[PDB]
Design a protein around this nucleic acid. Structure first.
Ligand SMILES: [Mg+2]
Ligand SMILES: [Mg+2]
Ligand SMILES: [Zn+2]
Lengths: 102, 102, 191, 182, 56, 56, 133
RNA sequence: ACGAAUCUCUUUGCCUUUUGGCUUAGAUCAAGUGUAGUAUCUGUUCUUUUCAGUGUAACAACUGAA
RNA sequence: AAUUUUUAAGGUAUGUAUUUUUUUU
């Protein structure tokens, strides 16, 4: 009559999963939040308009700005760069560099 | 200012198609019954094969145009507004409805 | 006893609270390592809530403040609710102000992918056997239950349009001609 | 149950857990077991990626490297970095476990060490040169010798590299390639 | 049982695993008292024999 | 919590408030009834207690 | 043909299963009734629309579309007999009259509309209706 | 100039799953450490007067006075 | 000054395919 308790289990397999597995899950979701859900494309994939359009992922996993040729560890770093004064300049330089030709 | 009830709207569209039709008639000028059986009451009406094909083509054409224009509003709609954070298309679409609510 | 919040773990709250709302705090700490729910909530209310007021102090406030703090002796939540400010700010100015005086979705998706793959497989089987001349028909997915229907075999529930006075009877012929034309095409050009 | 167990802080545990993958891979088969290991290189924590990289070296020796190697050379393509080191580290181990053999398998790995020594981040250029130290010593005297000029042409520009773990790995490579070339 | 409970595991237990009660002490109580709790003299009850044993 | 909403037609708000006062009255009345039933000792089952104490 | 046959069959399992569950949601009926049109089978498509008039006959997008599929392939006395059933069911409506009137314009027959407006005036509709007459 | 057709464009208008329900928020549960070392973002300062020494592959940098 | 005896169910899923004599070009 242990039904009095009120806990139970499903009959499938072996539950909890392994602490390492939780981190993989948690570091994907955190990079989904901060990314605001955008799919940042790989560098080799042969271009869904991007929110910006410069950020990518190299053949490795890292994120890169293709203007500035900087390498970034995480989305948090990227938003630092996109809000930086160097990534400002390289847009202006490409601004002029286009405004001198068509 | 303002909305329009489904009556007045119906009338307006009626007039619109009247004008369009009259233009087909004029341009066609520029380029240049009832029988009921005794056995059954079934009525029959003589028809010109022309203008019926023209009708079908008109309906199909207008459907194509409408579908396309709405499609262009689809395209611009998503490409215009990049301000707030969004996880997916559906989110952005909803928040543009929030822009309509203002 | 630090429990100190880096600007990353502040930036993940505001994205988590945006997602999960303010009463699901147990889920916010799933996105955020190092931090429990009671730690996440306590920061959202004391710091990060954008409806909080962190701003300079007008001349009426320090009058309003020193009025309350005198009329209510130490009660810094009750004062802060009067001032519409976080307490530890309304406390912290008051201590300086006194020294101013001083000197399923995924699973079904993937399963559907599997099913479609199986279809593709059987189809290309039939095409290859056809290329060798042996012709084999496709199979019916058995019957789950006794009365189960095969939709192709028959019009499911045929509701005759109605009778009517205008007596079509001719248009039906042209239709059937177009239909038999369609199927007669597919046997050859194959769409 | 072992693959979860090598999180342990003890060593003799971690060491015996890897040895019993060889005893199982001999029993049942290598490919059933690899897919268990390779799925575990995505994991972040370093012990787990190194202690899988050992096990793939052990499954290679015991069941033969030809069974393991094309599954590892394929896994190297994945764009995550932690895989790409773990597949280069696994190849270091498996070339010191099969000591003399290693000659049969060169020519296949020169293109895999081609992208490693060419790659931008400094750790790949560390682990591939740590493959060359094992691959040069015990394949010297074979008569490849034109694979080690290729592999040399790619290393020497790393002579200017700083970092302590990077520069000793590269010197070890240059000391070892000296015995393949002369 | 007061001895070793602490170190079972920590994070890992599933809900039932952690919250539910162990049947193990009741089994100990009904083994020790078995020959009264199982006795043939009963007022109303039916014999069964376990599969491979001679235990009624 | 008060449940104000930004622009919502007033009549709809009237409706929702009306039905929520009905449901609130039933919810409270059952909270009391089950509670006196528990007090005097009558059998209230189990989760009706655990449910009750949340209501109270 | 099996590259076709099993396509049509599998679709008719999916669409009916949904409509089986939801009697309402006319958005599905029109879609599924459109699928059977593009297969060049009028018999099935007419059944679907007729099946969907039972669920709600007050929904004019359904009524209108089922005039289209009749007019597009030019089945005349059907879309003609239909309009007997159409405006006798919902005689107040605006759109249903004008779409029956304006389609009679492109058929050039003014005797019809002469007698149409006879009834539609006999019904005493209102301002915008009379002004078209 | 005008009756007037067609393509292109802005606006008004029309609008999409604008979250499947219910109860005691239905209940409950969560982050290892130490030694050595590298990689990568952002912020802040300088392209600005002469000569003498230190320094550098050459710069740079550092050190004095008008 | 006299009680009263026990069986089921909520726990070990559920689903699909599988033994077939070659339907006329
Ligand atoms: Mg259960
Ligand atoms: Mg039940
Ligand atoms: Zn940049």
């Amino acid at each position: 009559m242990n039904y009095l308790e009120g806990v139970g289990s499903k009959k499938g397999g072996g539950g909890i999963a392994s602490e390492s597995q939780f981190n993989l899950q948690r570091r994907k979701e955190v990079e989904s939040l901060l990314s605001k859900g955008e799919n940042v494309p790989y560098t080799f994939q042969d271009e869904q308009v991007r929110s910006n359009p410069y950020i990518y992922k190299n053949h490795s996993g890292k994120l890169v700005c293709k203007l500035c040729n900087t390498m970034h560890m995480s989305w948090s770093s990227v938003e630092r760069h996109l809000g930086g004064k160097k990534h400002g300049l390289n847009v202006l330089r490409r601004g002029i560099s286009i405004e001198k030709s068509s | 200012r303002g909305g329009i009830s489904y009556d007045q709207l119906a009338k307006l569209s009626y007039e619109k198609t009247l004008r369009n039709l009259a233009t087909q008639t004029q341009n066609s000028s520029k380029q240049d019954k009832v029988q009921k059986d005794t056995k059954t009451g079934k009525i029959t009406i003589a028809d010109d094969d022309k203008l019926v094909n023209k009708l079908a083509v008109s309906l199909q054409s207008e459907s194509k145009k409408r579908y396309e224009a709405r499609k262009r509003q689809m395209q611009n709609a998503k490409t215009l507004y990049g301000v707030e954070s969004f996880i997916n298309d559906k989110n952005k679409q909803f928040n543009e409805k929030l822009s309509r609510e203002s | 006893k630090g429990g100190v919040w880096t600007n990353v773990e502040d930036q993940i709250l505001k994205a988590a609270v945006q997602k999960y709302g303010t009463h699901q705090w147990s889920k916010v700490a799933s996105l955020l390592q190092k931090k429990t729910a009671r730690q996440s909530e306590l920061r959202w209310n004391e710091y990060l809530n954008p409806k909080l007021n962190f701003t300079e102090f007008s001349k009426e406030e320090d009058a309003q403040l020193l009025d309350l703090a005198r009329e209510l002796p130490n009660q810094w939540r009750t004062i802060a609710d009067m001032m519409a400010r976080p307490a530890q700010v309304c406390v912290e100015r008051y201590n300086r102000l006194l020294e101013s005086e001083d000197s399923k979705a995924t699973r079904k998706i993937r399963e559907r992918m599997l099913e479609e793959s199986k279809r593709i497989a059987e189809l290309q089987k039939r095409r290859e056997l056809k290329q060798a001349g042996i012709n084999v028909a496709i199979k019916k997915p058995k019957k789950k239950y006794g009365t189960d229907i095969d939709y192709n075999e028959d019009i499911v529930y045929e509701q005759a349009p109605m009778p009517g006075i205008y007596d079509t009877s001719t248009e039906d012929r042209q239709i059937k001609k177009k239909f038999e034309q369609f199927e007669r095409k597919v046997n050859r050009k194959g769409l | 149950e072992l693959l979860e167990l090598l999180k342990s802080t003890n060593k003799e545990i971690r060491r015996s857990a890897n040895a019993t993958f060889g005893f199982i891979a001999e029993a049942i088969g290598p490919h059933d077991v690899l897919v268990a290991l390779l799925n575990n290189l995505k994991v972040q924590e370093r012990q787990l990626r190194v202690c899988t990289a050992v096990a793939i070296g052990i499954v290679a020796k015991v069941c033969g490297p030809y069974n393991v190697l094309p599954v590892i050379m394929n896994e190297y393509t994945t764009p995550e970095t932690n895989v790409q080191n773990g597949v280069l580290k696994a190849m270091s181990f498996m070339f010191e476990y099969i000591g003399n053999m290693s000659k049969d398998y060169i020519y296949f790995i020169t293109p895999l060490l081609e992208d490693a020594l060419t790659d931008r981040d400094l750790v790949h250029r560390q682990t591939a040169s740590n493959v060359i130290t094992h691959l040069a010593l015990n394949c010297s005297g074979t008569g490849h010798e034109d694979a080690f000029i290729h592999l040399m042409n790619l290393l020497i520009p790393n002579i200017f590299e700083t970092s302590p773990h990077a520069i000793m790995r590269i010197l070890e490579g240059l000391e070892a390639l000296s015995q393949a070339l002369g | 049982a007061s001895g070793f409970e602490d170190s079972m595991q920590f994070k890992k237990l599933t809900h039932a695993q952690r919250t539910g009660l162990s049947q193990i002490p009741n089994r100990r109580f009904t083994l020790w008292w078995s020959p009264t709790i199982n006795r043939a003299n009963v007022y109303v009850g039916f014999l069964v024999q376990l599969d491979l044993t001679g235990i009624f | 919590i008060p449940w104000d909403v930004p622009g919502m037609p007033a009549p709809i708000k009237k409706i929702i408030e009306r039905y929520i006062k009905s449901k609130a009255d039933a919810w409270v009345s059952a909270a009391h009834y089950n509670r006196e039933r528990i007090k005097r000792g009558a059998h209230v089952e189990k989760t009706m207690v655990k449910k009750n104490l949340g209501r109270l | 043909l099996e590259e076709l046959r099993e396509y049509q069959r599998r679709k008719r399992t999916e669409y009916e299963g949904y409509l089986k569950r939801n009697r309402l949601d006319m958005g599905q009926w029109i879609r599924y009734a459109q699928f059977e049109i593009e297969q060049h089978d009028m018999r099935r498509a007419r059944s679907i629309f007729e099946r969907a008039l039972l669920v709600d006959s007050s929904f004019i997008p359904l009524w209108i579309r089922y005039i289209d599929a009749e007019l597009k392939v030019k089945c005349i006395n059907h879309a003609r007999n239909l309009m007997n059933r159409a405006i006798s069911t919902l005689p107040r409506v605006d759109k249903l009259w004008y779409k029956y009137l304006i389609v009679e314009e492109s058929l050039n027959n003014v005797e019809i509309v002469r007698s149409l407006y006879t009834k539609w005036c006999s019904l005493e509709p209102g301002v915008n209706a009379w002004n078209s007459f």
